[PDB]
């Protein structure tokens, strides 16, 4: 009743081209990493270059799930734009009331899993999943948000 405070989050997945329902109940770690950097990508010729807009834009996703779905998992036992739709909530410190919901959506996510969880002792499962943000050539994609704090 002192300061062991903490919140929760929702993680929703989806497979494109059909209405497949895949989601994650809870994400404890939920380490979100965003990187912008550059080293050198300009020759420097043509007198007036007239343009430069390079910016390395990567979005990293990480969830831990114990709920895959057998509805399809069993059928597949005997890909798609895993596209991800994060869900969470926000609170106002002045009132501390449930009034706002925050959605985060990614329409093109390709999982980049590492096959090296080599460890001696048996853990509490905890199959941490890490994702990479993939983009097409056309336009848009990356992240989309919806605000639900209307009053």
């Amino acid at each position: 009743m002192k300061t062991v405070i903490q919140d929760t989050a929702d993680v929703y997945f989806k497979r494109k081209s059909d209405g497949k329902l895949v989601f994650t109940a809870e994400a404890q770690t939920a380490s979100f990493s965003q990187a912008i950097s550059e080293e050198k990508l300009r020759g420097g010729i043509g007198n007036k270059p007239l343009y430069i807009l390079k910016s390395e834009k990567e979005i990293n996703l990480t969830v831990k799930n114990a709920f895959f779905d057998l509805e399809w998992l069993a059928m597949t036992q005997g890909s798609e734009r895993y596209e991800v739709e994060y869900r969470t909530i926000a609170y106002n410190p002045d009132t501390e009331e449930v009034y706002s919901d925050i959605y985060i959506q990614f329409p093109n996510v390709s999982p980049s899993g590492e096959f090296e969880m080599s460890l001696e002792n048996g853990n509490a499962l905890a199959p941490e999943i890490k994702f990479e943000a993939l983009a097409d050539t056309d336009t848009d994609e990356m992240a989309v948000v919806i605000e639900a704090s209307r009053d």
């Binding site: 983009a135 097409d136 948000v145």
Partner: protein, 670 residues
């Protein structure tokens, strides 16, 4: 515990309350006359001692010892990355129990485990026939960690595999799993040292520590102790030439390095050794470069007026290839420093590079594929490829790497943008000879032979495509007009239009006839084509039609932005062309006055085109990192409002926790 064995090879008394039997032995070692006062009865045991005693390298006690020196060498061929010779040895028949143990070790080294487990099964069956003590328990540990690895990988493919590889790859027969699970229901390793004959431990007290989970506890404690020990020793003292810092660290480092790596025990691929090597290597580089740049008033350099400089050896490089993810500069260049040392001699490390490259080409060039092998090779190869950039050597090494990366690397684990990142960072410390240019040209030809698919989109996480390869080719050699690209452009008619994007992306590397054909095949209607034409440098000025098109695009942006604001769905526009338009306006490139009616869409646009009516409370500091273009200097050459610029600069550098924000103006004006 009668003597405390310092890892430096010298021994000290710990609990010896009796005669100095180690003192007697060490004083006998240095005296040949006393060595001549013994019969063959003790000589038969002197012969036995000699071998391993000098194999480790114990010299004397800590009192009279002078300048010491340890021997570092690895006979672990599995560590030498030559799998063909181990396959050759595997095909060899059986000789004896010890040889069976070695062969089991190499079978485990290949990754597949079925026949390996069968082999340890038979060896447990017949081990008591030879009544060999230690190897029996070593084989217990063997089969235990083999099963642990199999079940862990199974849990990994257990789920994860279907999403990753698309198909449920079952590399093990269900009968095998049923048998192993029925024979390992209850087995826990704690009593593995409790149920063995009591004559075992009286002769093998030391070796029990490899059974339980204490395989790392005794080791990392001193590591994480000395880490802060030297990190806080820092650069003001605790100073001597060969007793400062990692002195004992190399000792234990290469003493326990080959322990499992030469006895041929199995979990040589475990995150414990990822951990141990990464930490160890970090301590070495840290002591070296804290020596390097330390301030010396008078006595800082009077001590150790020589440096070890961390002259890394082939063994360290292989460690980085095997068990390194940050690989050390990946985070310890954003954090740590670098300045030259000598990346020294090479004996056959180029042969190891080809021992990686040719094995990769043979594997990915063969239809047969082992998923366990691919999973146990992909990460180590990724590390080796990522850190073969800084090496400079006879291009024996370069062309095989380029060919293997271009033609055999899996496309599920990497996209084109990260591929170019690998090839661009390859040339950071290396030039561009003709062979690599030919190889990448052949790769581009293969890509052109691929671009017929009606649904392929070339999805990438970096935004860079095959056009960047021709761009790099022009950057190192402008006069390399292509040959086959002109042929494929000429052979393409107006009926098919799916290659228009690729031809526009790679139009600079085309013949004059190809250029004329593409000019007859040009089309500019949407926004992307204009951006691409500007990118290649073809477009110099702007026609009124382009201004009208950009005004229409801005009007559409406004009429959808107002709708989004009405509902309340904030906008992102990840490919923020509005910032590009702000850049257009700021640099006097477009001198129109019709874009001032759209002020307020984004904070960046307000900062760019509205300097008089902008509030600096919404200043995002990431706007200084988008680039390194001279454009940053041009826009930072401010006099009117530079007070706010220096205010935010001093607020940011008060922490001084980002090296970019300081090295941007380190000596730019100078």
């Amino acid at each position: 515990y009668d003597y405390h064995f310092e890892v430096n090879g010298t021994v000290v008394r710990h609990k010896n309350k009796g005669f100095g039997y180690m003192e007697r032995f060490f004083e006998l070692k240095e005296s040949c006359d006393e060595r001549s006062k013994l019969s063959k009865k003790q000589y038969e045991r002197f012969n036995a001692l000699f071998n391993f005693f000098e194999k480790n390298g114990v010299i004397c006690m800590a009192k009279d010892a002078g300048t010491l020196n340890t021997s570092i060498e690895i006979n672990s061929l599995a560590y030498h990355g030559k799998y063909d010779v181990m396959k050759k040895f595997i095909e060899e028949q059986s000789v004896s129990i010890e040889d069976d143990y070695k062969k089991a070790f190499f079978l485990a080294c290949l990754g597949r485990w079925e026949e390996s487990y069968d082999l340890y099964s038979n060896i447990i069956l017949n081990s008591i026939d030879e009544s060999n003590g230690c190897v029996y328990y070593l084989s217990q540990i063997n089969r235990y960690r083999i099963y642990q690895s199999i079940t862990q990988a199974v849990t990994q493919f257990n789920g994860l595999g279907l999403l990753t590889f698309g198909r449920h790859y079952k590399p093990f027969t269900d009968e095998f799993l049923a048998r192993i699970e029925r024979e390992m229901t209850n087995f826990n390793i704690d009593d593995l040292f409790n149920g063995m004959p009591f004559e075992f431990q009286k002769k093998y007290k030391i070796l029990e520590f490899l059974s339980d989970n204490q395989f790392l506890y005794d080791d990392t404690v001193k590591l994480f102790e000395l880490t802060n020990k030297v990190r806080s020793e820092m650069s003001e003292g605790s100073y001597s030439f060969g007793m400062s810092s990692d002195i004992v660290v190399l000792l234990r480092l290469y003493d326990n390095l080959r322990f499992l790596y030469e006895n041929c025990l199995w979990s040589v691929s475990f995150h414990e050794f990822h951990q141990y090597i990464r930490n160890s290597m970090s301590l070495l580089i840290e002591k070296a470069e804290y020596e390097r740049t330390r301030d010396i008033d008078e006595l800082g350099f009077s001590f150790f007026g020589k440096k070890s400089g961390f002259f890394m050896e082939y063994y360290d490089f292989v460690n980085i290839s095997r068990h390194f993810k940050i690989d050390d500069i990946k985070n310890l260049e954003r954090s740590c420093s670098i300045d030259k040392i000598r990346f020294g001699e090479q004996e056959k490390i180029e042969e190891y590079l080809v021992g990686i490259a040719e094995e990769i080409t043979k594997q990915f060039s063969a239809n047969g594929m082992n998923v366990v092998f691919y999973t146990q090779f992909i990460s180590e190869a990724k590390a080796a490829l990522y850190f073969a950039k800084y090496v400079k050597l006879s291009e024996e090494g370069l062309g095989k790497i380029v060919k293997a990366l271009l033609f055999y690397f899996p496309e599920r684990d990497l996209d084109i943008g990260k591929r170019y990142v690998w090839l661009e960072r390859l040339t950071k410390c290396n030039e561009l000879p003709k062979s690599i240019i030919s190889i990448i040209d052949d790769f581009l030809v293969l890509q052109a032979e691929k671009h017929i698919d009606q649904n392929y989109s070339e999805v990438s996480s970096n935004g860079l495509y095959s056009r960047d390869y021709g761009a790099l080719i022009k950057h190192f050699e402008k006069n390399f007009i292509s040959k086959r690209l002109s042929e494929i452009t000429l052979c393409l008619t107006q009926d098919k239009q799916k290659q228009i994007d690729f031809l526009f992306k790679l139009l600079p590397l085309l013949s004059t006839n190809a250029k004329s054909h593409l000019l007859s095949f040009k089309s500019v209607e949407n926004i992307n084509d204009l951006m691409n034409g500007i990118r290649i440098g073809l477009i110099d000025e702007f026609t009124p039609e382009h201004e009208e098109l950009i005004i229409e695009y801005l009007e559409t942006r406004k009429v959808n932005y107002i709708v989004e604001k009405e509902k309340g769905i904030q906008t992102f526009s990840s490919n923020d062309y509005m910032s590009t338009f702000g850049i257009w306006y700021f640099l006097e490139e477009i001198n129109n006055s019709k874009m001032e009616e759209f002020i307020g869409m984004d904070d960046q646009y307000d900062f760019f085109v509205d300097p008089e009516n902008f509030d600096y409370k919404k200043f995002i500091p990431s706007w200084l990192k988008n680039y390194n273009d001279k454009l940053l200097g041009k826009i930072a050459g401010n006099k009117h409002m530079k007070h706010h610029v220096i205010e935010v600069l001093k607020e940011r550098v008060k922490n001084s926790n980002d090296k970019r924000y300081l090295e941007i103006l380190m000596n730019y004006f100078i």
